[PDB]
Subunit: 88 residues, 2 copies
């Protein structure tokens, strides 16, 4: 009868179709109103770990990619060891 209906939008595959990552194009007001009115907003995404390593900031949007880095990192080798098999 009366409804504002949306159709069906396909999903893009980040590993299967084309390598896709995140980059901030948004601003400071994030789900604030939704948090107050309890719309139960989300907050889980493929965060790119922009962390400080050896003097430079790294950006990893994939732990699989970070695995390749952490493994050959003598220091980080003993850090990610718990989720990534080490010992070379």
């Amino acid at each position: 009868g009366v409804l504002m209906d949306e159709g069906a939008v396909l999903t893009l595959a980040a590993d299967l179709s084309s390598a896709t990552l995140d980059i901030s194009k948004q601003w400071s007001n994030v789900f604030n109103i939704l948090r107050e009115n309890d719309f139960e907003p989300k907050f889980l995404c493929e965060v790119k770990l922009a962390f400080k390593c050896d003097g430079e900031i790294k950006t990893f949007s994939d732990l699989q990619s970070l695995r390749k880095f952490a493994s050959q990192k003598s220091s980080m080798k003993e850090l990610l060891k718990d989720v990534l098999p080490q010992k070379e």
Copy 2:
């Protein structure tokens, strides 16, 4: 000292060249070890607002696109009218 150089890495235009959208293919361990070792991991990324709106769960990874939604949504028009320009 000698260490580990890399090649040449570039970035992607956020929505300017192609739509930047987040899709979770990661698992449970979210940069935990990096935090415990104080590499200072990130967290600020383009998250999808997977919230309950009008009975259905919506996913908005781009709040710009959400502005297009809440403007036609009378319900959310009364929520976001405080931050978004509403003449209605």
